[PDB]
Write a protein that binds this DNA or RNA. Structure first.
Lengths: 52, 54, 57, 131, 88, 226, 156
RNA sequence: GGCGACUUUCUGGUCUGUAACUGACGCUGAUGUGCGAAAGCGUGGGGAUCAAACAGGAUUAGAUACCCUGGUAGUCCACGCCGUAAACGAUGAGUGCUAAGUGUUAGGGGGUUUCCGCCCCUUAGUGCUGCAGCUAACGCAUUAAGCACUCCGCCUGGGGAGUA
C-alpha cells in the first residue's frame, strides 16, 4: 500500500518486492492452499521454530 | 507498570506497518509485557483507535 | 550488501608474552586479552611495520 | 508422608557412600540416633554428632573410607519393613556374610549388633544388614 | 468464591479463641459456605464440569476433618452438626 | 630449596583456570574462588601437590627409569621438547600415534626403521635409485621423525609419564592405566583428576604457566641421577 | 606357570557378497590353582593359534581370589548383565559342584569345595564374566578389619 | 480428554512470600461413583465452507484408488446417549535421597544501580546436554528407566482371540 513516485518503474518494483516479502501475504496463502490437520501444523510450526 | 489501551502513541510503535503485531523477537520486550500488551492492542482494535489492516 | 563474518572469542587474563605466543599459534595479527597485572583489556597486534603494537581499550 | 523413616535413613547412607561423600545429615529419632551410634562402635562410620534443633534435631554421620580410596560399607540392606515385619528367635538369628558383616536387631534391651544378641540369648525384630 | 468480609464474618462464630483461624471447626464452616456457594453456581450452570471436581475435592476435605474431629472429642462434633446443618 | 616460591609461581599465571560454564565438579578441591567468569586455582594447595610431584620423580630416576614427556597442545608443543633434552628423556611434539605404548611391537618395528633409513643413505645404495623414489624414501624419513622424533633412541617401555593435558591427550592416559604405569600431569578446569595419580593443578593455556612449571619437573630427575 | 583350559570354540561366519567368512573364536580360562585366575577371548582362523591368542589375552587381566582355605570366604552372587552365578561356601570334603563354563573358572583357582548354581542366562561369555565379577567382590576376614578398624578376633 | 478474537458476570485450581493458627488431621485406594478426542446414535434446530456415500470427466496395462467438477449424511448449536483412540512421556500414584552445565516461564530476597538494564542466591514449572548408577542393547539420567519404602493396576510362549 506504499506509493512510489519520482523514479522509474524498475525501481518501484524493488521497493514493492521487499514490501511484500516483509508481509504475511505470500507465506500466508501458500500455507492455506490446502487444509492441514489440526495437530500437524503444531509440528509444522515446531519445525519452523526449532530451526529458527 | 500496566499498558492502558487509550495510550495510542506508545501502543502504535508496536503495531506493524500494515496493522499486524510485531513479535517480541523483533521488538525485544519481555514475556509478560508482550501479553499484557496484546490484550491492550486488541481492545484498541475494537474501538477503532488502531486498524486491523491498513 | 557486505557480510562481515564474526569470530567470537572469550576474553581471558594473561601476560603480554602469552598473548604473543597464542597469537603466533594461530597466525592472527590481532589478539585481545585482559592484561594479567594491569587488569585492562589489551589488544596485541602486528603493525604494517611487522613489529608488534599494544593497544589498551 | 514418607512411610519408613529408618529405611530413608539407610538409603541416605548408601547414596552418600556411592559418590564418596564424607558428611550428611538426617532428620533423626531415637532409633535413628542409636543405629547411627552402633555403626561407629562396630566401626563403619567415623563419628556421629549431636542432636540440637527445636523440632526433630538433626545429626551428622561422617562416613569412613579406606586408605586406598576404598569404602568400608559395601552394601546396606533394610530387611524388616512395613507390610512384612520379620522377627527372629535367638536360635536362628542369622550371621551376615559368613560372620563378616553385622545385623543390628531391635530386641527388648535396646538395639544391639549381630554378635551381642546370641550370647545375650535374646531375639527380636531384625532391622537391617550392614556390610 | 466468597468475599473476605464474608469469609472473616464466618470465622467469628466458630472461632474458639481470638486469633485461632485454622482450627477444624473454623475451617469446616468456611467450607460449608464454599460448598453452598459453588453448587448454587453449579445449579444454574449444569455443564461446568471443571468446577465440579473443585467442589468434589473440598467435599472430601470437609469429610476428612469431620472424621478427624470425632476421633478426639465427640461432643464438639455434635455441636457443629446442630450449628450448621449437615447430615450424618 | 624445596618448592617453587609464591612470587614466581603466580607470576607465570598458574592461578587462572578455564571458564565457569566449562567446569568439572571433581576439581572443587583444587579451586580457590570464582572471579568474573573464570576460576582461581588454590595456589597454596598446588604447592602442597608440586612438592609431592617432586618427591617421587626424584626417586624414579634414582632407579634409572625412563619418564615419557608428552605435549600436543599448540601453545605448549615445543616447551616440552627443550625440557626433555635438558632432562635426557623422550619427548612427544606431534599427535599421539595411537599405540606407541600399547602396540609398540609394531612401533619399535619402525623405530628399527629410523635407525636404518638414515643409515641407508649415508652409505651407498643411493645413486642407483630413481630420483622420485629418493623423494618418498625421504618423505618417509621426515614423517617418521615428525611423530616418532622423540622416541628416536627409546627401545623399551617407560616407567612414568608426564602429560600437559589429560583432555587433548586422553589417548595416552587410557594406555597408561592399562599398563599400570604411574602418571603425573598438569590439570585444571575441564580436566578429570581421577585418572591422574599424581595431580598438579596449574593453568594450561599459557606458556609461562607451562614453561615455569614443566621445567622443574624436568629438572626433578637430574638430581635424582647423582 | 599357567594352566590353559578352553570353554568352547565357536564357528562364526559373516555374510559377504562373494565367499563368506571363516572366523573361529574361542574363550579360555587361565588360572594357577592358588588364588589367581583370568579369562579372555581370541579371534583367529588357525584353531591352535586361536587358542593361544585367547591365552595371552587372559594374561593381561588376573584377579586375586581371596580364600579361607579349601573354600571361598563368604556367600556372594555375581552379576554381569543377565548372567548371575551363586556361590555358597562348603565343607572341605564336598567337591566343587558347578555347571559347564563356571566349573572351569572355579577349578583353576584352588577351592575344590563350594556350592554353586548358575542362575539367569546361559551363554558362556557372560557367566564366566559374571563369576569373575563375583570373585572380584570377595573379602577376607583380615583385610576388612584393617578397613573397619577392629581385629580379627573383635569381628567375631 | 483438552483449551487461541474481545468484554462482562459466575466459578475451580496452582505457585511465591510471611510466619499468626489447627496439631498427624497423612498417603494409596479394590467394589463404587463421575469426567472422557473424534466418528457414531436419538429428539429437534441450523446449514457457510469442507466433505464419506454417490454422479460424471480424465489417467493407467487395469480401478471401486490417485486427479478434477458436482454433491448427501456429517462437520455447527441445544438436550439426552454411547465410553471407546498409537487416550502415548508406548513409562501408576506418593515421599525422600544422589556430579554439574545450560535455555526459558511464574514469583521472592539481595547487590550495584539501571535513568526499568544486568549480576549472584533461592522456590515452583518447562526443555536441551551429561557423570555416578542402571539397561539385553538403544538409551535413561534431580521432570530416572539411579538408590529406597508404602499402596494400587497388570504380565507370565505364539496363534486360536479380545473370538465362543
Amino acid at each position: 500500500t506504499v506509493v512510489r513516485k519520482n523514479e522509474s518503474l524498475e525501481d518501484a518494483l524493488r521497493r514493492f518486492k521487499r514490501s511484500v516479502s516483509k508481509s504475511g501475504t505470500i507465506q500466508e496463502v501458500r500455507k492455506r492452499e490446502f487444509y492441514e490437520k489440526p495437530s500437524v501444523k503444531r509440528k509444522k510450526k515446531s519445525e519452523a521454530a526449532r530451526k529458527r | 507498570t500496566h499498558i492502558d489501551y487509550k495510550d495510542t502513541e506508545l501502543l502504535k510503535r508496536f503495531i506493524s506497518e500494515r496493522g499486524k503485531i510485531l513479535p517480541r523477537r523483533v521488538t525485544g520486550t519481555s514475556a509478560k509485557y508482550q501479553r499484557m500488551l496484546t490484550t491492550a492492542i486488541k481492545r484498541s482494535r475494537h474501538m477503532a483507535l488502531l486498524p486491523y489492516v491498513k | 550488501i557486505e557480510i562481515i563474518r564474526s569470530k567470537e572469542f572469550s576474553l581471558k587474563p594473561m601476560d603480554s608474552e602469552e598473548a604473543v605466543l597464542q597469537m603466533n599459534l594461530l597466525g592472527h595479527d590481532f589478539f585481545v586479552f585482559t592484561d594479567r597485572e594491569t587488569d585492562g583489556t589489551s589488544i596485541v597486534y602486528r603493525r604494517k611495520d611487522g613489529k608488534y603494537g599494544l593497544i589498551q581499550t | 508422608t514418607m512411610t519408613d523413616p529408618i529405611a530413608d535413613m539407610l538409603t541416605r547412607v548408601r547414596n552418600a557412600n556411592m559418590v564418596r561423600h564424607e558428611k550428611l545429615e538426617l532428620p533423626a529419632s531415637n532409633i535413628k540416633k542409636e543405629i547411627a551410634e552402633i555403626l561407629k562402635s562396630e566401626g563403619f562410620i567415623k563419628n556421629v554428632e549431636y542432636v540440637e534443633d527445636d523440632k526433630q534435631g538433626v545429626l551428622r554421620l561422617f562416613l569412613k573410607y579406606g586408605q586406598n580410596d576404598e569404602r568400608v560399607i559395601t552394601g546396606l540392606k533394610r530387611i524388616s519393613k512395613p507390610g512384612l515385619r520379620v522377627y527372629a528367635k535367638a536360635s536362628e538369628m542369622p550371621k551376615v556374610l559368613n560372620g563378616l558383616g553385622i545385623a543390628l536387631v531391635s530386641t527388648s534391651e535396646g538395639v544391639i549388633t549381630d554378635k551381642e544378641a546370641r550370647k545375650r540369648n535374646v531375639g527380636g525384630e531384625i532391622i537391617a544388614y550392614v556390610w | 468464591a466468597i468475599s473476605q468480609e464474608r469469609k472473616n464474618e464466618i470465622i467469628k462464630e466458630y472461632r474458639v479463641h481470638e486469633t485461632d483461624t485454622g482450627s477444624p471447626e473454623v475451617q469446616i464452616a468456611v467450607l460449608t459456605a464454599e460448598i453452598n456457594a459453588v453448587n448454587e453456581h453449579l445449579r444454574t450452570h449444569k455443564k461446568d464440569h471443571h468446577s465440579r471436581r473443585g467442589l468434589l475435592k473440598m467435599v472430601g476435605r470437609r469429610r476428612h476433618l469431620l472424621n478427624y474431629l470425632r476421633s478426639k472429642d465427640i461432643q464438639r462434633y455434635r455441636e457443629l452438626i446442630k450449628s450448621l446443618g449437615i447430615r450424618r | 630449596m624445596a618448592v617453587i616460591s609464591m612470587k614466581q609461581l603466580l607470576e607465570a599465571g598458574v592461578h587462572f583456570g578455564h571458564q565457569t560454564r566449562r567446569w568439572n565438579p571433581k576439581m572443587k578441591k583444587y579451586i580457590f574462588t570464582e572471579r568474573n567468569g573464570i576460576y582461581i586455582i588454590d595456589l597454596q594447595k598446588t604447592v602442597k601437590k608440586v612438592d609431592e610431584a617432586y618427591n617421587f620423580l626424584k626417586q624414579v630416576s634414582e632407579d634409572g627409569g625412563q619418564v615419557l614427556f608428552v605435549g600436543t597442545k599448540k601453545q605448549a608443543q615445543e616447551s616440552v621438547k627443550s625440557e626433555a633434552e635438558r632432562a635426557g628423556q623422550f619427548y612427544i611434539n606431534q599427535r599421539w600415534l595411537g599405540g606407541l605404548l600399547t602396540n609398540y611391537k609394531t612401533i619399535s618395528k619402525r623405530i628399527k626403521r629410523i635407525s636404518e633409513i638414515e643409515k641407508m643413505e649415508e652409505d651407498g645404495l643411493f645413486e642407483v635409485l630413481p630420483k622420485k623414489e629418493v623423494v618418498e624414501l625421504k618423505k618417509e624419513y621426515d614423517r617418521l621423525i615428525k611423530f616418532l622424533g622423540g622416541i628416536r633412541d627409546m627401545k623399551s617401555m617407560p616407567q612414568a609419564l608426564f602429560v600437559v593435558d589429560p583432555r587433548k591427550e586422553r589417548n595416552a592416559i587410557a594406555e597408561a592405566r592399562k599398563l599400570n604405569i604411574p602418571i603425573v600431569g598438569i590439570v585444571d578446569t575441564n580436566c578429570d583428576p581421577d585418572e591422574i595419580d599424581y595431580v598438579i593443578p596449574a593453568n594450561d593455556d599459557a606458556i609461562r604457566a607451562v614453561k615455569l612449571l614443566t621445567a622443574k619437573m624436568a629438572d626433578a630427575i637430574l638430581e635424582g641421577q647423582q | 606357570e599357567f594352566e590353559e583350559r578352553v570353554v568352547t570354540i565357536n564357528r562364526v561366519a559373516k555374510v559377504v557378497k562373494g565367499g563368506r567368512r571363516f572366523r573361529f573364536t574361542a574363550l579360555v580360562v587361565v588360572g594357577d590353582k592358588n588364588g589367581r585366575v583370568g579369562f579372555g577371548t581370541g579371534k583367529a582362523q588357525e584353531v591352535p593359534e586361536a587358542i593361544k591368542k585367547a591365552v595371552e589375552a587372559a594374561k593381561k587381566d588376573l584377579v586375586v581370589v581371596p580364600r579361607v582355605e579349601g573354600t571361598t570366604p563368604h556367600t556372594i552372587t555375581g552379576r554381569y548383565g543377565s548372567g548371575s552365578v551363586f556361590m555358597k561356601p562348603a565343607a572341605p570334603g564336598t567337591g566343587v559342584i558347578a555347571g559347564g563354563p563356571v566349573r572351569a573358572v572355579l577349578e583353576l583357582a584352588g577351592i575344590t569345595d563350594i556350592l554353586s548354581k548358575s542362575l539367569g542366562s546361559n551363554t558362556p561369555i557372560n557367566m564366566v564374566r559374571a563369576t569373575i565379577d563375583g570373585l572380584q567382590n570377595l573379602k577376607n576376614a583380615e583385610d576388612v578389619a584393617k578397613l573397619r578398624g577392629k581385629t580379627v578376633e573383635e569381628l567375631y
